Every structure is written in C-alpha cells, then in structure tokens.
Amino acid sequence: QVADLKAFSKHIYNAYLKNFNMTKKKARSILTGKASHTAPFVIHDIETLWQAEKGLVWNGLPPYKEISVHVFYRCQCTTVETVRELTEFAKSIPSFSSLFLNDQVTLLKYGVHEAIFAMLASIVNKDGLLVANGSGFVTREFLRSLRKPFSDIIEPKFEFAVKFNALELDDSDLALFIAAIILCGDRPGLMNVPRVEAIQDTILRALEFHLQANHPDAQYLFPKLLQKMADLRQLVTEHAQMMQRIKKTETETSLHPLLQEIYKDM
Ligand SMILES: Cc1cc(SCc2nnc(-c3ccc(C(F)(F)F)cc3)s2)ccc1OCC(=O)O
Ligand SMILES: CCCCCCCO[C@@H]1O[C@H](CO)[C@@H](O)[C@H](O)[C@H]1O
C-alpha cells in the first residue's frame, strides 16, 4: 500500500501544521537569527527574567514564591499549553477520534510527556531554549543556576535534544513520529489494545516510507528513531521521579491540576 500510506502521512502532517503554534522550521530560523528584524530577548539572570516579565516578552500564575519556583510555574504553564495542542493534534487524526473516549484519555495520559520532550528538541540548542512562542530565549546556564531541585529538571532534556537534533528531522518527519508516540499499544489500561496496535503499526510503516523518500541518504534512520522512542520513555520515567520528589519536598510549590491528574498512578 505504498500510496495509501503517503496520503495517510500527508493527513497527519496537515493535523500537525494546523495545531502546533511553533514548528521546527520556524524555531530554527529564529535560533539562527534569520526570522525577524529583532532577535529573541535573552533571559540569563534575575534582571533579564524580571525584564521579560514586565511586558518585554509577556498573569494568572499562582502567588509568587521565589525565582526557582517562578520558573517552575512557567514550565507548568508551557506544558499545559503543549498538552492542549497535542490533544487537538490527536483529535485531528480520524483513527484517534474513533477510539473509546476513555482510550483517548489513556493515550494522552501516558503519551504527552514523551511527545513534549520530543518536540522540545525543536526549540533547543546547546545554549538554551526558546520561550514565549519564540520571543524569548532562556539560557541553559541560567537554568543550571537555579536552586536544587529545580536546576536538575531541565538539564537532561538538553542532553537528549542535542543528540536528537543531530538526526536532522523536519516537521513532516516529526508529525509522524509524534503520532506514533501518541498511538501506542503498550499503554496501561487500554480497553482495545489490538485496535491501537494496528494504528501504531500503520503509522510506523508510513513513517518508514516517509523517511525513505525524505532522507534517502540517511543510513539506519528508522531504527534510530525507534530507539529514540525507547529513550524518551526512560527520560519521562526520570522526569516523573523528579516531579515526585518536588511534590514531596517542596510543599509550598503549587501543582497544576491537569498535570497532577496526568501523573496520578504512573
Ligand atoms: C518542570 C518541567 C520541565 C519541563 S522541560 C520543558 C520546558 N518547558 N518550559 C520551560 C521553561 C519555560 C519558561 C522559562 C523561563 F523563561 F521562565 F525561564 C524557563 C523554562 S522548559 C517539562 C515539564 C515540567 O513540569 C511539568 C510536567 O512535568 O508536566
Ligand atoms: C507538574 C506537577 C505535577 C505533580 C506530580 C508530582 C506527583 O506525581 C506522582 O508521581 C508518581 C509517578 O512517578 C505517581 O505514581 C503518583 O500517583 C503521582 O501523585
């Protein structure tokens, strides 16, 4: 079915183009200083963070605690908005919308963080990360300087992102990769596992064909990406352990209810 899969792919790419605020194409043009007549405002210390908050780049956040917790809250806000986009992306996939509504929630529940860290790589380079829909750039050094434990959260995502970005995927590749992360039969408590497994396999087959066409000189790209899916599960496991520790030890720190639900029983 060499051409049913091409149509399938184009539909998933269109769902992606329609629902994600930041594409990798856009992200990389910003990060190489070739997108606007003004660069992103660089946040690298307390003073620039404060300037960014005074309308320079940017509220409904919880009551201010301190700098490390403030950044933690902004990470939560960003995560909530990316979860919203991922849900619309998934719903824009017909095979997803026909599943048990409770299976839809199960797939999102166990898939969004894997997808988030995959997409994170698109707005990351070795020196920092885009924020505020590209209008700011927060430095990796600044994040390293936060108070423990908050300074340990993000550093592992940088390590993953730089290796992942070496594969030089584009948005059409990423649309299928994310779709495969969400439509995953290994997720606990699925009601119709064979139905999800068949969609997953269709997506992976589409992805394999897409890569042959899109990257014809890349050797072993498909099995490399499967390994990255495995790596993303470990990355999320470690992230969840750090979140657990923050919930245990940082009891002044507020936790968004949607995100607390996602982590409940993992
Ligand atoms: C704690 C946490 C981290 C991540 S890493 C991806 C990132 N997202 N936003 C980030 C950010 C936004 C703004 C700034 C500022 F500009 F303020 F400095 C700095 C960083 S970094 C993902 C989820 C997380 O916790 C929610 C969860 O686990 O659901
Ligand atoms: C973004 C803030 C979200 C706060 C989440 C911190 C606590 O989550 C807990 O993490 C465990 C997985 O490691 C689950 O097994 C627990 O049921 C759940 O309560």
Side-chain angles (χ1 to χ4, degrees):
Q1 294 160 350
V2 188
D4 297 295
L5 291 187
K6 194 185 178 182
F8 184 82
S9 293
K10 195 179 115 169
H11 182 85
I12 287 174
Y13 189 22
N14 289 332
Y16 180 100
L17 291 178
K18 170 179 169 76
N19 284 284
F20 293 116
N21 247 308
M22 181 65 62
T23 61
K24 179 166 181 182
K25 187 182 177 173
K26 179 165 185 252
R28 301 262 69 118
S29 77
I30 300 172
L31 298 176
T32 61
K34 263 61 184 307
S36 58
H37 284 309
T38 61
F41 181 74
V42 174
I43 300 164
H44 63 94
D45 55 13
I46 289 170
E47 204 249 5
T48 54
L49 172 60
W50 182 75
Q51 282 165 353
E53 289 295 353
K54 281 175 66 74
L56 174 50
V57 300
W58 276 285
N59 56 89
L61 303 183
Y64 178 82
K65 286 306 163 68
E66 64 171 280
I67 296 320
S68 294
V69 170
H70 176 72
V71 176
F72 187 65
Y73 287 154
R74 285 235 168 260
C75 291
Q76 292 193 51
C77 300
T78 297
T79 301
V80 164
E81 179 59 44
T82 301
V83 169
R84 186 180 293 122
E85 293 185 324
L86 283 159
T87 300
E88 299 311 309
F89 171 64
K91 288 195 294 182
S92 287
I93 303 165
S95 36
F96 177 89
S97 302
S98 84
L99 298 169
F100 294 126
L101 202 78
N102 71 308
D103 274 353
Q104 301 183 25
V105 168
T106 294
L107 292 181
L108 292 171
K109 176 182 173 72
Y110 292 91
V112 290
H113 282 95
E114 288 179 12
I116 286 156
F117 297 142
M119 296 186 89
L120 188 57
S122 298
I123 61 176
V124 160
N125 63 34
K126 68 184 192 65
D127 295 322
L129 165 148
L130 298 170
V131 299
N133 193 66
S135 54
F137 181 85
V138 65
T139 71
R140 185 178 180 175
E141 200 36 52
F142 175 70
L143 300 166
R144 277 187 214 249
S145 83
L146 296 177
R147 176 187 96 190
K148 277 184 173 199
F150 302 96
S151 46
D152 287 343
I153 304 296
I154 304 196
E155 176 63 18
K157 288 54 170 190
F158 279 102
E159 295 175 17
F160 172 94
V162 174
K163 303 193 190 115
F164 190 74
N165 284 341
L167 303 174
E168 293 182 305
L169 304 184
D170 68 28
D171 285 305
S172 67
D173 310 325
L174 285 170
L176 289 160
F177 185 78
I178 302 311
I181 287 167
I182 301 309
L183 286 154
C184 175
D186 307 340
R187 305 303 190 197
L190 279 180
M191 212 150 71
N192 193 349
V193 168
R195 179 43 180 169
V196 176
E197 284 186 341
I199 300 167
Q200 180 185 274
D201 202 70
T202 304
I203 294 167
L204 290 178
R205 284 155 124 96
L207 177 57
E208 181 179 57
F209 169 60
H210 182 73
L211 296 179
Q212 279 186 311
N214 206 29
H215 309 258
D217 299 324
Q219 259 72 27
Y220 288 92
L221 185 49
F222 184 64
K224 281 171 179 170
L225 287 182
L226 299 172
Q227 185 56 63
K228 293 306 186 183
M229 294 176 189
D231 302 341
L232 280 167
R233 289 195 203 189
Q234 186 53 41
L235 193 70
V236 164
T237 294
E238 292 158 6
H239 184 82
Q241 290 165 0
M242 297 187 288
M243 298 303 286
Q244 175 87 97
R245 291 310 298 177
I246 287 167
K247 177 184 171 166
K248 178 53 163 73
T249 66
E250 300 288 346
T251 47
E252 307 301 295
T253 294
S254 168
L255 314 174
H256 189 289
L258 172 62
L259 304 181
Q260 180 70 78
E261 198 71 84
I262 293 180
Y263 281 104
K264 209 227 289 174
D265 308 317
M266 273 195 47

